[PDB]
Amino acid sequence: QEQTYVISAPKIFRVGASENIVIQVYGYTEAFDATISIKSYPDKKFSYSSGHVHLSSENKFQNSAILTIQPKQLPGGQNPVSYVYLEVVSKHFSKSKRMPITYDNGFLFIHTDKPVYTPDQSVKVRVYSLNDDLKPAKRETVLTFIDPEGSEVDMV
Amino acid sequence: QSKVRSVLRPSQFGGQPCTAPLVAFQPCIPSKLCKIEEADCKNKFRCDS
Amino acid sequence: VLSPYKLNLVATPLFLKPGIPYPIKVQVKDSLDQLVGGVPVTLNAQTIDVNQETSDLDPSKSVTRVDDGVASFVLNLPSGVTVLEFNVKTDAPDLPEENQAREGYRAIAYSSLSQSYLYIDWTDNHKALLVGEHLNIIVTPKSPYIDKITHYNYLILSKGKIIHFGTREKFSDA
Amino acid sequence: VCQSGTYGENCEKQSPDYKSNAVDGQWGCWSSWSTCDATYKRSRTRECNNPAPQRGGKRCEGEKRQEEDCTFSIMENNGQPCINDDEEMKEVDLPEIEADSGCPQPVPPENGFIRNEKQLYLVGEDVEISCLTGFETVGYQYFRCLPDGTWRQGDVECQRTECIKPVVQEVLTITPFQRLYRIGESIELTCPKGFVVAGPSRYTCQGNSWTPPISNSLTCEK
Amino acid sequence: GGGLNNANVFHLAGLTFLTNANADDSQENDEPCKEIL
Amino acid sequence: VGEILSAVLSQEGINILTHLPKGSAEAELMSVVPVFYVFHYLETGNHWNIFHSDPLIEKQKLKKKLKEGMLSIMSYRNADYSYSVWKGGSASTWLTAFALRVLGQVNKYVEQNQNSICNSLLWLVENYQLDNGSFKENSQYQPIKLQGTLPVEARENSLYLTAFTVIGIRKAFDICPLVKIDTALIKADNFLLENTLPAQSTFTLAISAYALSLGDKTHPQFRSIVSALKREALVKGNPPIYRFWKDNLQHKDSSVPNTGTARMVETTAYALLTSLNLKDINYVNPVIKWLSEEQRYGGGFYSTQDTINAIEGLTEYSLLVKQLRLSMDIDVSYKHKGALHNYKMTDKNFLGRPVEVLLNDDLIVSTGFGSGLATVHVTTVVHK
Amino acid sequence: DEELEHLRLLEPHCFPLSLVPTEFCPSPPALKDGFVQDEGTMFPVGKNVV
């Protein structure tokens, strides 16, 4: 069992995140290529993303693919996708594992111009909107205001 | 995925046996998920089996 | 409160590298917890190395740091230790042990089948690494088969994501 | 498989005592099922013909025919469910913890009922009461679930509008004129033969009730 | 850091891994780990 | 709307239309009786709007079949507008009530003449209204298996008849309003109620509750009987995923449809239709799911009763979902002063902001016809 | 012939791999006042661009 591999990945894929998947192989000398792929689960039919990676002593037989799950390519609807296949394919091995996915992507920092307001006031409010990559997300955002009784009062 | 065929007549009295398998299996990639779950059997002592 | 203090670990792994000085840190806290910083604390420990030879350690003593709250300890455990379990108690002489808050904790070795390990020379430097400095960590695989282990591989991960990956070769120095 | 007194690999040679040679008879298998009959029953038959009985051999045993209902998969059966033995519960099932502390269903006011019953209502959910057929709402008909599980209980109560056509154990002794009456209207209690057994010969719902004789609704003699 | 095992090390590191080298992360699950650093 | 459970027919609707060959035993009747209800089901519209997973049912084939069904069902009317399955057979109030139910549905394409319906109803009520119980079957003790269903034991067996006739009458009533028939309804409901108070065996309770859900939906004893039905429900899971009813040791095994599985499927379809009349979508859901499983596979006894009543319930559910689907363009204005505001209340925008009713005028609120339900409040603050 | 398709599909590492792509799109079309965020020489079938 000298010829072996490790593919390592985040515990959970974030939807829309650019996820960097790294691969190392051992007991190989002939340089060869592998593909790391993210595929629909369970049917593996649709492929969300794929990365060709080349392995050689020139790379000390190490490489990574950057793979991503653009949110519209998921089927969506009432049942969001809970799980996705991570796959690796080579001349020497093929394997796939059921990764979990999460739609928790980035940060929405609400900032209200004060913590206390009288009646007969208007709040100024703004939201800082950042990716998982901490870049400005440039996404549509919605606010919902709940009274102390838990009654929804406004959405914008 | 299972594929089958049927005997049209048996051999007997020392005729040629049918020789070929009546059932073939092929590894699919399934469409659905399994809906199985373990039985809790309430209080009863669950053997490790 | 008669037992107003409470105690917890901070940043401690509960995993042992044998022979390497194993650091322990504790934060004393109150009900409505602040960093008390002024409490004496002491440590008592028991160990196992092989075939369950139960070996007790000598106790140790630290003050809490007045600013950090941290009481710190380091144990020069046996080169062959397999598990440690221990108690930490408030040693404030004005509080009896029914009042001097105390806790018990267990740590366990990496349990390699191949007796094959990869320890790091990290003290757990308490001070935040400044951006744009070069980190240097020497890394020490130890194994029956180190001659085989041409290189170790490293990954630096931030948040959810791998951000650096690479390879770290064996010198002729072994 | 060979009868005792015959041997060889397929029972081919008889012992000297063996009698009644070429006695035969055993079942053939069933037909495929018939098309469904007038009563939507299918059937199949087996002919006792493999072999036909001979020389006093038995008729092929048992029932020569089967008959069965005709039945089909009506609904979209997309997959077999895992269904277990003794799976049901009665209403005896233990109530959930309700640890989310959403409000339990309120008791409606007297002469009130809930339009939309549920086991639990969300915080900020509101429930509508309505009055029974004989009753009218006075007050604000909604309760609103607060974060502590209380109900913002409105002042609403359902007042009596009307008195129904009264029911007491005797048949007849009553008028068909209406199923419902305003308060203070008469009720005619008309005896079929002009007699009175108990209570007033003619009475009225006194707002609260008729206060009638409960034991005997004018059991007049005939 | 650290871990009871290779699989435990990777899981606590927030990774998972595919390997033929006689280990798998399916031994562990997303427990509500809530230690303090 | 909440949870929507997509219970639908298989491709077997082709069979349910093309049903087992027309002929004697009124195999013809048993074949066309599902046709009317399949028609009604598709008149949810969706299924005519979209069959595209499979080759379409030809709409003109359906219209033909419906017309032929009406032609057949006329053949079973007695001269006196009673009904007999045989042309010279004994007149039956049972079959009359069945016909009246069917003939309530068809009118969108083929109305039956109201006179003939009135004559049928008049004959039924005038001959067989009774002082206590009602509509005792006139002259046919011989049951029919696949058209009929198990009668009760003699004790309050009138419950079944009263309920069944009531159902058919109510479905015909909108095409023959007659005050004497209304009176017969009131009487029948009173008797069936007074006989349901002792909780006769649960099938009678379920069918009576379904009859009562056509009547005064807020009658206190009706609501008590519904509470009894609810106490008799069976469920799976602490939050019920499935709900159904068993009686008469139907907890025995049945790997095939049979009289006991029939009893189960009908009693559950009746509890379903009762709760659908209470609009009780949240309670209906686990019933729809349990029905969808077809557990007790093949269904009922494959009677025309169990299948008809199941597909009726599923149709009603399919209707109710689209009913609750929210689209309601509210407009609000003062009476003498001008318009105040408009809310495009929609599933995607289900909650507009509260609005200050500044002006000292009477306030009128209304909406386009639209769809679904809303609640609108005004509150007043005064310093006293 | 059921093998030549199906098992090659299921266990491609078991067979000769023409792993490197052989079919490609043209270069992605330009936007007004915009660009493809990642340039590249090769655009295999099924590749996304953003």
Swiss-Prot record, chain A:
- Any stretches that span the bilayer, and where are they? none
Coiled-coil region(s): none
Q: Which domain of life is it from?
A: Eukaryota
What protein name is recorded for this chain? Complement C5 beta chain
Q: Which species is this record about?
A: Homo sapiens
From Swiss-Prot, chain B:
The similarity comment for this entry is: Belongs to the complement C6/C7/C8/C9 family.
Q: Outline the extent of the TSP type-1 domain.
A: 1-35
Lineage, opening ranks: Eukaryota, Metazoa, Chordata, Craniata, Vertebrata
Task: Provide the disease association from the record.
Answer: Complement component 6 deficiency: A rare defect of the complement classical pathway associated with susceptibility to severe recurrent infections, predominantly by Neisseria gonorrhoeae or Neisseria meningitidis.
Native source organism of the sequence: Homo sapiens (Human)
- Described function: Component of the membrane attack complex (MAC), a multiprotein complex activated by the complement cascade, which inserts into a target cell membrane and forms a pore, leading to target cell membrane rupture and cell lysis. The MAC is initiated by proteolytic cleavage of C5 into complement C5b in response to the classical, alternative, lectin and GZMK complement pathways. The complement pathways consist in a cascade of proteins that leads to phagocytosis and breakdown of pathogens and signaling that strengthens the adaptive immune system.
Q: Where in the cell is it found?
A: Secreted; Target cell membrane
What's the name of the protein?
Answer: Complement component C6
Subunit details: Component of the membrane attack complex (MAC), composed of complement C5b, C6, C7, C8A, C8B, C8G and multiple copies of the pore-forming subunit C9.
User: What post-translational changes are documented for it?
Assistant: All cysteine residues are assumed to be cross-linked to one another. Individual modules containing an even number of conserved cysteine residues are supposed to have disulfide linkages only within the same module.
Task: Specify first residue, last residue and whole-protein length for the fragment.
Answer: 100 to 148 of 934
Output the superkingdom of the source species: Eukaryota
* Encoding gene (name): C6
UniProtKB/Swiss-Prot annotation, chain G:
Annotated family: Belongs to the complement C6/C7/C8/C9 family.
Q: Assembly and interactions? A: Monomer or dimer; as a C5b-7 complex it can also form multimeric rosettes. Component of the membrane attack complex (MAC), composed of complement C5b, C6, C7, C8A, C8B, C8G and multiple copies of the pore-forming subunit C9.
Q: What is the recorded name of this protein? A: Complement component C7
Q: Where in the cell does this protein reside?
A: Secreted; Target cell membrane
Function (record text): Component of the membrane attack complex (MAC), a multiprotein complex activated by the complement cascade, which inserts into a target cell membrane and forms a pore, leading to target cell membrane rupture and cell lysis. The MAC is initiated by proteolytic cleavage of C5 into complement C5b in response to the classical, alternative, lectin and GZMK complement pathways. The complement pathways consist in a cascade of proteins that leads to phagocytosis and breakdown of pathogens and signaling that strengthens the adaptive immune system. C7 serves as a membrane anchor.
Mod. after translation? C-, N- and O-glycosylated. O-glycosylated with core 1 or possibly core 8 glycans.
Disease annotated for this entry: Complement component 7 deficiency: A rare defect of the complement classical pathway associated with susceptibility to severe recurrent infections, predominantly by Neisseria gonorrhoeae or Neisseria meningitidis.
Organism of derivation: Homo sapiens (Human)
Q: Where is this region: CCP 1?
A: 1-50
- Residue spans making up a coiled coil are none
What domain of life is recorded for the organism?
Answer: Eukaryota
